[PDB]
Nucleic acid binder design. Structure first.
Ligand SMILES: [Mg+2]
Lengths: 210, 52, 49, 51, 327, 105, 47, 49, 48
DNA sequence: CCTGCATCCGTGAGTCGAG
DNA sequence: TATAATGGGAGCTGTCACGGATGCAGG
């Protein structure tokens, strides 16, 4: 204030007191610290794979067995990402894919009622929570609210991709049946692989008593 | 039984990398490390030392 | 012959089955003491022995 | 061309968007009265295709 | 570990307001909005724009995002341009900037302070088709609406005015999102009314009512058909993964045929139909061929007309073998 | 999926990555000359909620006065840890004390 | 028609597998010997 | 046991409707919702193993 | 009976709770038109 | 601190038929 | 759209045996 006469001694945030006619700077820093997939993705983009490969290579020469082991385990992932041409930040999702409606059908059965896949409900959760997150962002919601919302979003993506993987599995109202995620569809004894690929039900077949 | 055991014996673990880009303790197929070694020998390079 | 508005959905005897029809039951909406599940106009049962 | 290989790899967000025929916006399925796919819904024909 | 316990912990971090603090924050908010209107009268910018710039500066550099309401994209560059056009105003005018800033800060503090109320309200709405946390979030939206719409002049404690909006938003959410097939809110009201009515009638009658009795207790305009159709529209779909049997073996969706894709016999039906029609058309003269096939649309997909009609009547009565295709 | 791929690349334990992704603790991309507990903030450091709140927003505390009791110290006066703000109240931290809602003018 | 049965083509369940793997954000590509993409959707899924 | 479950749920409903509404005009008819009990028993006799 | 603690007003009533399925003479039930049987379940007797 | 053993967590657990 | 209301609620209990990672006390 005062045309540049009075300035600040320390880093901090400004509270202008009009009553006491004083500019009070609370001691604080501009420090950039985040939470969740934003922070993690940022950390992923910054990664220089060649550099880390070099560091891990230097670590590979240490007389300790465990250190060489862990350095190897890391270097395998690093070199995997290197050779594959895959950016590590792709492990974090911006655009979530949406499966074609016929692989998650809403279809009227014989009785005139409707039958629908659980993927539709999971997608519904995800979409609703994403919309609410966007609206809360545009309306200038506080910290804690946006935090909880982002957490819920992450758990909705979790529920969609693999359900019951982390925490208690998402279920339908008044039901203990865990919903079927994409992971549940692919793997397992009832999974797409074993059930619909390695074996099939076939036409031109029959059976009877011998 | 010999077929199955043969499938069990398929893998090796690198004891020393030699002149390769391979790492110590890395596990790869015996065939692959043998072709790699035969290529390095033809290149005059020090081969990879591996444990069954 | 002009195109007809409806199509033949009729209940037919399944393969390898059959017999003599012993009984029939017909429940209709608007009949005394008869109420079906919502939307259902009528329900027919056929007992074949 | 006969398929001689199958490759699996991570999908970039740009790739995921290059797959999509549109963004699903509303968390809606079908109209209650018409039983037709709702616009910008999970079943919307303007995205996935004609019924 | 548990998301709800974590949220309840993060909620217990903000201490509850004393009456003086509540009044103070509300006052600062209201005067802040007034100050924004004032700055709009001074600078000549959009009240929404100025508000979002003030908010941008209060929240931090972390949050700057394009607002659907604004006429321009809000980047930090633009918020700095506008901030520089606000700061360069005369002193007595520049006062309102500070007023608005502390207004926004007070708003944030006020919303964060009352978050427990949303929990205690949403705990009554459990099991209605929405998760606890979702109810909590929509209730939070209600709380924000309350903060923006609150008037401290009326000397009413903030919880009173906020509770209404919280219930409003929670209920709006329960009505909107709780059904896979979306039914408009008023129709949901109708359905719920019908259900309550049926429960009453069945409570007094010692048995489940008919459609006519429901139509009676429903009043004018209501008959059996409408009750039946309304109950019909209120039916929720069932999951294809609904377990069939005691074990994990098969799903309900494995018993449902696909009525869309033609079975091989249907493709063969079209094939044999086009074939038989093509081969039995030998009667056709060329002009009548192109014109009658344009009549029936056998070419581009959409007096001699009469002679071709008559000739087709002639060849129908001939072979008597095409009946099969006619179902 | 153990061992975590993301966790392996960025060198974080399952517990830590869990804490960050699910919004328990923060993590620092740009310290910006921050200092906590006498040691400056290193990048890739996990901060609790309280720690980040203190670094970003500063430290402060409010002390309630029993009704009808004047304080021992005035408005805008500097305060040292241990210095009592009232006959019944002692301050935990340093910094400036301020008057919240004076009952008597 | 009394003729011999035609050469079989790609089973639908593998297509279902590919699309379900895509919804998991994993790209599964069918390739030729020259490492070029082969389209099993016949241009139906490509814009 | 299922009767007991539905009964406890009914009780939860009773308390929930007790806290709200007019504290003056209320009757056991307006307090008691039998739906959870009916649903418990019906679920038992229909869908139990 | 609804009993007010403060007021003391006691409002007594008989409310209809729905129906309980009845067991037939032979020991079975009729649920939705179909004859059913509830199978007795052995388990560990509670205690210490 | 580097090695070794104790402990936790996730992953599996036959086929077809009928319901 | 205004009395005031300010931290949830159910839990699922009698398998068994493995690989891998993670951690702690001990040499
Ligand atoms: Mg009527």
């Amino acid at each position: 204030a005062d045309g540049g006469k009075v300035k600040s001694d320390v880093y901090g945030r400004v509270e202008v007191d009009l009553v006491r006619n004083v500019v009070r700077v609370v001691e604080s820093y501009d420090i950039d610290a985040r939470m969740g997939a934003e922070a993690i993705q940022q950390l992923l983009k910054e990664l220089d794979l060649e550099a880390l490969e070099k560091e891990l290579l230097e670590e590979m020469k240490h007389p300790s067995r465990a250190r060489r082991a862990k350095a190897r385990k890391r270097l395998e992932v690093v070199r995997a990402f290197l050779d594959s041409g895959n950016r590590p930040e792709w492990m974090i999702l911006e655009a979530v894919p949406v499966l074609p409606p016929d692989l998650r059908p809403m279809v009227q059965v014989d009785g005139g009622r409707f039958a629908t896949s659980d993927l539709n409900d999971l997608y519904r959760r995800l979409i609703n929570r994403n919309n609410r997150l966007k609206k809360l962002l545009a309306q200038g919601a506080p910290e804690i609210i946006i935090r909880n919302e982002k957490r819920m979003l992450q758990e909705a993506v979790d529920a969609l991709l693999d359900n019951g993987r982390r925490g208690a599995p998402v279920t339908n109202p008044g039901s203990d049946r865990p919903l079927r995620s994409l992971t549940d569809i692919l793997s397992g004894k009832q999974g797409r692989f074993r059930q619909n690929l390695l074996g099939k039900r076939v036409d031109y077949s029959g059976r009877s008593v011998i | 039984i010999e077929i199955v055991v043969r499938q069990m014996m398929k893998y090796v673990e690198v004891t020393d990398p030699g002149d390769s880009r391979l790492l110590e303790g890395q596990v790869l197929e015996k065939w692959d490390v043998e072709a790699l070694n035969e290529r390095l020998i033809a290149e005059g390079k020090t081969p990879v030392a591996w444990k069954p | 012959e002009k195109a007809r508005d409806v199509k033949d959905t009729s209940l037919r005897v399944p393969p390898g089955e059959g017999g003599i029809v012993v009984r029939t039951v017909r429940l209709r909406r608007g009949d005394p003491g008869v109420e079906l599940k919502p939307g259902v106009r009528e329900v027919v049962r056929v007992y074949v022995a | 061309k006969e398929v001689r290989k199958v490759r699996i790899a991570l999908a970039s967000p740009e790739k995921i968007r290059s797959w999509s025929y549109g963004e699903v916006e509303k968390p809606e399925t079908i109209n209650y009265r018409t039983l037709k796919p709702e616009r910008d819904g999970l079943f919307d024909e303007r995205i996935f295709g004609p019924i | 570990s548990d998301p709800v316990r974590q949220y309840l912990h993060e909620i217990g971090q903000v201490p509850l307001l004393t009456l003086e603090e509540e009044v103070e924050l509300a006052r600062k908010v209201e005067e802040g909005m007034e100050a924004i209107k004032k700055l709009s009268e001074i600078t000549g910018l959009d009240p929404d724009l100025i508000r979002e710039v003030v908010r941008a500066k209060i929240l931090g550099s972390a949050r700057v995002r394009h607002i659907p309401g604004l006429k321009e994209t809000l980047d930090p560059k633009t918020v700095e341009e506008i901030d520089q056009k606000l700061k360069s105003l005369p002193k007595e005018h520049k006062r309102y900037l500070h007023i608005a800033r502390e207004g926004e800060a007070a708003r944030q503090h006020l919303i964060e302070a009352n978050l427990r109320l949303v929990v205690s309200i949403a705990k009554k709405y459990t099991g209605r088709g929405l998760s606890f946390l979702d109810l909590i979030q929509e209730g939070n939206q209600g709380l924000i609406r309350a903060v923006e719409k609150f008037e401290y002049k009326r000397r009413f404690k903030f919880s009173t005015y906020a509770t209404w909006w919280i219930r409003q938003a929670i209920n709006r959410a329960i009505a909107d999102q709780a059904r896979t097939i979306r039914i408009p809110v008023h129709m949901v009201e109708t359905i719920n009314k019908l259900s309550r009515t049926a429960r009453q009638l069945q409570q007094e009658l010692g048995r489940e009512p008919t459609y006519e009795e429901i139509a009676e207790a429903m009043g004018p305009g209501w008959d059996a058909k409408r009750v039946e159709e309304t109950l019909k529209i209120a039916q929720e779909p069932v999951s294809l993964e609904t377990p069939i049997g005691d074990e994990k073996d098969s799903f309900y969706g494995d018993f449902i045929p696909d009525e869309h894709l033609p079975s091989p016999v249907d493709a063969a039906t079209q094939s044999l139909l086009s074939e038989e029609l093509e081969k039995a058309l030998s009667k056709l003269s060329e002009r009548e061929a192109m014109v009658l096939k344009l009549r029936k649309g056998l070419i581009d997909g959409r007096q001699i007309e009469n002679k071709a009609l008559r000739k087709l009547k002639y060849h129908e009565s001939r072979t008597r073998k095409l009946r099969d295709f006619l179902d | 999926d153990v061992p975590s791929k993301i966790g392996t690349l960025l060198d974080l334990s399952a517990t830590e990555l869990e804490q960050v992704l699910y919004f328990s603790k923060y993590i620092v991309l740009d310290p910006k000359g921050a200092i906590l507990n006498g040691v400056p903030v290193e990048k890739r450091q996990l901060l609790t909620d309280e720690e980040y709140r203190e670094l970003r927003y500063g430290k402060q505390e409010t002390y309630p006065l029993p009704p009808g009791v004047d304080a021992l110290v005035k408005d805008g006066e500097e305060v040292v840890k241990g210095q009592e703000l009232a006959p019944g109240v002692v301050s935990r931290l340093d910094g400036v004390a301020l008057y919240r809602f004076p009952r008597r003018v | 028609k009394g003729e011999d049965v035609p050469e079989p083509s790609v089973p639908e369940s593998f297509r279902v597998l590919v699309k379900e793997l895509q919804a998991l954000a994993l790209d599964v590509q069918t390739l030729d010997e020259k490492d070029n993409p082969v389209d099993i959707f016949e241009g139906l899924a490509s814009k | 046991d299922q009767f007991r479950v539905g009964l406890a749920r009914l009780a939860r409903g009773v308390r929930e409707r007790m806290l709200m509404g007019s504290e003056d005009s209320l009757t056991p008819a307006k307090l008691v919702n039998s739906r959870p009990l009916e649903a418990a028993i019906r679920e038992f006799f229909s869908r139990s193993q | 009976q609804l009993i007010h603690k403060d007021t003391g007003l006691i409002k007594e009533d008989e409310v209809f709770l729905g129906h309980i399925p009845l067991m037939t003479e032979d020991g079975s039930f009729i649920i939705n038109g179909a004859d059913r049987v509830i199978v007795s379940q052995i388990h560990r007797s509670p205690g210490v």
